[PDB]
């Protein structure tokens, strides 16, 4: 649900003009879309594997 | 104490020769029994279409009485000392041999010389050996493996003497006279074409003087003595299909043309066939076996058995495989077998070649166990190589085979070549010859 809220942010930013608050927000949200799928999701499944004693 | 040191302490073979050209060979091994016999260059490839059942007819009359010991008197003498008589006939060789006690050696050599020189082909034993041979032919038709290898020779060597069968057709058996058998012995049972071999508790000096006492009256050179002409035989890619749906299983044999006896390519081609292997449904190994075709057929229950062969003649041969399966499995067995031939022409690894070399070393020493297989190896190596190749020489040829040698020799004999196919039984799912011929080359390499 953090990934769904990240795609709502990019839909709002993409209809805004290219100004001061909508460049630092629109480029950090572009980073977090790739950080969740590639890095954060495989590490969190391994942490949940250790907590269930397998 | 070492396998290398044990190959040095094997006793050697001593060869001699008489004035007529007869060779005499022995191996002494310090045991109270022995095996002595006579090996002849004769067979069905020396017969034409008029006398194709001549050499197999003569092997039947060989123990039925000679001039000195008529009728059953030969059989009473062999049995009363506890000895055994045996014989066989292939397409190129003929043998008679005796297993006896090593102190009965002078009597054993005397009986063998009377069998091959003075055998009576009496006209009442003929016309009663015809019906025995005619009934034996009907018994051979129930053996599916013997029928399908006769089909493979008849289609690979179509218009040559090498396509004939050993037994000969049934119309020849009905008409072979006494005159045709006496011409067969005079033309073929000749002393430079014969070998007297012995293994066991034998001294070579004793066998040589027994050979001079009983065999010296053999004709050395002949009347007009023309050189025995050797017509070679060519290979033809072809197929023969015998469809019979009432039989429960199907037999299929396929081969390409292989090398002759004295070709040095024979040793790495036997390392290669030992990687494919053999399988049978009574094996305990099953799905864990090293051979890929054996492990697949055990997991999916594809066949009853398969085997690979290496048949050699003087100038040519057959190199292939034979399998038995049900009517729904022929297309899958042919697909996996042809994929293993192409995977040795390319891609053959060093770890497969180490296993295949260990199999061939074990099969060579396991054959030479007992006086009868040692004596047969002496008698047919002198007709084939002109000498006995010792076990230390076989090991140095095996040790120089590696993975790149196997890839070169398999590509030479298998890759993009026309095979010969034979099939018998419920064979509607045996693939078309165009689809079989396309299986001998790849898309990539």
């Amino acid at each position: 649900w953090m990934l769904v809220a990240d795609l709502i942010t990019l839909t709002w930013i993409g209809g805004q003009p290219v100004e001061h608050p909508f460049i630092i927000i629109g480029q950090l949200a572009s980073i977090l879309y790739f950080l969740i799928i590639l890095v954060l999701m495989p590490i969190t499944s391994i942490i949940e594997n250790n907590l269930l004693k397998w | 104490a070492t396998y290398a040191q044990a190959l040095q302490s094997v006793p050697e073979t001593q060869v001699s020769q008489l004035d007529n050209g007869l060779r005499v060979a022995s191996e002494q091994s310090s045991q109270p029994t022995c095996t002595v016999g006579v090996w002849i260059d004769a067979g069905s490839r020396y017969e034409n279409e008029k006398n194709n059942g001549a050499g197999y007819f003569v092997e039947h009359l060989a123990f039925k009485g000679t001039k000195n010991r008529p009728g059953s008197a030969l059989e009473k003498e062999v049995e009363s000392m506890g000895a055994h008589l045996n014989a066989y006939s292939t397409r190129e060789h003929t043998a008679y041999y005796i297993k006896a006690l090593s102190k009965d050696l002078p009597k054993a050599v005397e009986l063998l010389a009377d069998i091959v020189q003075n055998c009576s082909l009496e006209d009442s034993q003929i016309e009663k050996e015809r019906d025995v041979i005619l009934q034996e032919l009907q018994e051979n038709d129930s053996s599916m493996r013997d029928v399908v290898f006769d089909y493979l020779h008849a289609t690979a060597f179509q218009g040559t003497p090498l396509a004939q069968s050993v037994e000969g057709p049934s119309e020849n058996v009905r008409k072979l006279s006494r005159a045709d058998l006496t011409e067969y012995v005079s033309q073929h049972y000749k002393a430079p074409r014969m070998v007297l071999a012995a293994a066991g508790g034998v001294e070579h000096r004793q066998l040589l003087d027994l050979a001079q006492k009983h065999f010296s009256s053999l004709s050395g050179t002949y009347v007009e003595d023309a050189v025995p002409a050797f017509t070679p035989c060519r290979f033809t890619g072809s197929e023969i299909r015998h469809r019979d749906d009432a039989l429960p299983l199907a037999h299929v044999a396929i081969a390409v043309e292989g090398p002759g006896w004295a070709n040095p390519d024979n040793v790495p081609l036997q390392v290669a066939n030992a990687i494919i292997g053999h399988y049978d449904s009574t094996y305990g190994g099953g799905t864990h076996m090293s051979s890929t075709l054996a492990s697949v057929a055990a997991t999916r229950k594809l066949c009853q058995s398969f085997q690979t062969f290496n048949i050699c003649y003087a100038e040519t041969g057959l190199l292939g495989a034979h399998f038995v399966c049900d009517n729904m499995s022929i297309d899958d067995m042919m697909f996996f077998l042809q994929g293993q031939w192409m995977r040795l022409c390319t891609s053959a690894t060093e770890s497969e070649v180490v296993r295949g070399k260990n199999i061939l070393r074990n099969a060579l020493v396991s054959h030479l166990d007992g006086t009868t297989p040692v004596c047969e190896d002496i008698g047919r190596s002198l007709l084939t190589y002109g000498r006995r190749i010792p076990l230390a020489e076989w090991e140095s040829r095996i040790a120089e085979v590696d993975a790149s040698v196997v890839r070169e020799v398999c590509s030479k004999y298998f890759y993009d070549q026309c095979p010969a196919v034979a099939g018998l039984g419920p064979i509607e799912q045996l693939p078309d010859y165009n689809r079989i011929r396309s299986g001998m080359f790849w898309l990539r390499f």
Binding site: - | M81, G82, L85, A363
Partner: protein, 418 residues
């Protein structure tokens, strides 16, 4: 040279080794087990045990046993009689130490896992149907059931109702009670005697003595007839004779070769076989006839075996039985006795030529008698058999109670009381 080195261990194990200088080696373990030691509740356990030598053990998995033996080109085989089982390993001289380790895991620490034993039950049906394509095999299993009430009447193959129901607990119980060190012998053929001994001190932690006494076999004079659709009639007719390792057993071995025990010449007419000549006087059709001899540790069987056509089967059995009656009333020449001693002497020396026959011969002597005897001693015991003892062994057959088994079209085959 170096004839044999024979040794008893303090736990009862027999070790024998002969040092060849042959490139191959052979190791065999011989056990007093087999079908005579099972009872009516576990029939067929020793047939499944014979088929289970590749399964997972405690020291090696089933993958490593198949791959590890095939990597050096070796073999592993099991052979069984009613009284013994034998585990054999062969390879080249430099590979023998790692195949000796596989042989000790199979026989001294097996696991019988549930899913592996359950997958092997269908192999019992394949193995029995292959063996029963020979008509001799089922006739000889019916003959032991007709002759005994117990303990030699059990078949070498599993009964049909029992296929699918041999359990892992039965296999564990059979090995625990019958694979013990005082019932075992270890025979080597290309290995030195110190190497086999420290091999042997790696299976003595369990299996310390004798496990279970078997029941003594009791003779039954029965008869089993099996009508089917075969083209020829197979029949056998026996009586009780003598146990192995006695002076009367040697007289029955000579009597077998007087009568006829197989052919010597290829496609010969069997001129010295007195059984074959007496049948062929009145019968002018295809047949075969032989003398049968089976010797065990506490009993034995001796008789005749005929193969004939259906309409001629009564004539073949009656003329074969009449020839044995002539020997029992004194008609016996010393020329025929001396010719029979030559076939028995030469056949024993020829059966010990190969490595396979020599290793089996040392293994049977170690379990039955617990010693080794040179073949010069065996050849003098055959020489001491007199003409009066051959006539007296044919009188024990003629006056003894008979057993019979037949198969084929039995419309002209006589009953055992007729």
């Amino acid at each position: 040279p170096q004839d044999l080195e024979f040794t008893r261990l303090p736990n009862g194990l027999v070790i024998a080794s002969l040092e060849n200088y042959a490139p191959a080696s052979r190791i065999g373990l011989f056990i007093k087990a087999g079908s005579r030691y099972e009872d009516s509740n576990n029939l067929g356990t020793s047939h499944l045990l014979r088929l289970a030598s590749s399964l997972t053990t405690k020291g090696a998995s089933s993958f490593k046993i198949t791959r590890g033996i095939e990597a050096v080109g070796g073999k592993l085989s099991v052979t069984s009689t009613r009284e013994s089982m034998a585990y054999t390993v062969e390879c080249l001289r430099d590979d023998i130490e790692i195949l000796m380790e596989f042989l000790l895991n199979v026989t001294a620490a097996p696991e019988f896992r549930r899913w592996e034993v359950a997958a092997l039950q269908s192999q019992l049906r394949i193995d029995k149907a292959v063996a029963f394509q020979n008509p001799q095999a089922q006739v000889l299993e019916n003959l032991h059931a007709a002759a005994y009430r117990n303990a030699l009447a059990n078949s070498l193959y599993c009964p049909d109702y029992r296929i699918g129901k041999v359990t892992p607990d039965q296999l564990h119980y059979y090995v625990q009670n019958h694979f013990t060190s005082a019932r075992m012998a270890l025979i080597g053929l290309g290995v030195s005697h110190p190497v086999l001994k420290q091999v042997a001190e790696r299976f003595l932690n369990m299996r310390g003595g004798l496990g279970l006494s078997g029941a003594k076999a009791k003779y039954r004079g029965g008869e089993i007839r099996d009508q089917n659709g075969d083209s020829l009639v197979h029949a056998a007719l026996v009586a009780e004779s003598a146990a192995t390792g006695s002076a009367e057993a040697n007289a029955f071995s000579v009597l077998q070769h007087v009568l006829g025990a197989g052919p010597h010449v290829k496609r010969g007419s069997n001129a010295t076989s007195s059984l074959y000549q007496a049948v062929a006087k009145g019968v002018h059709q295809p047949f075969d006839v032989s003398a049968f001899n089976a010797s065990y540790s506490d009993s034995g069987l001796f008789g005749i075996y005929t193969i004939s056509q259906a309409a001629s089967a009564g004539d073949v059995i009656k003329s074969a039985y009449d020839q044995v009656k002539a020997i029992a009333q004194g008609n016996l020449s010393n020329t025929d006795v001396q010719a029979a001693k030559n076939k028995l002497k030469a056949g024993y020396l020829m059966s010990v030529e190969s490595s396979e026959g020599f290793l089996d011969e040392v293994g049977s002597q170690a379990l039955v008698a617990g010693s080794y005897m040179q073949p010069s001693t065996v050849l003098q015991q055959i020489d001491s058999v007199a003409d009066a003892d051959v006539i007296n062994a044919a009188k024990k057959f003629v006056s003894g109670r008979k057993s019979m088994a037949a198969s084929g079209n039995l419309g002209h085959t006589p009953f055992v009381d007729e």
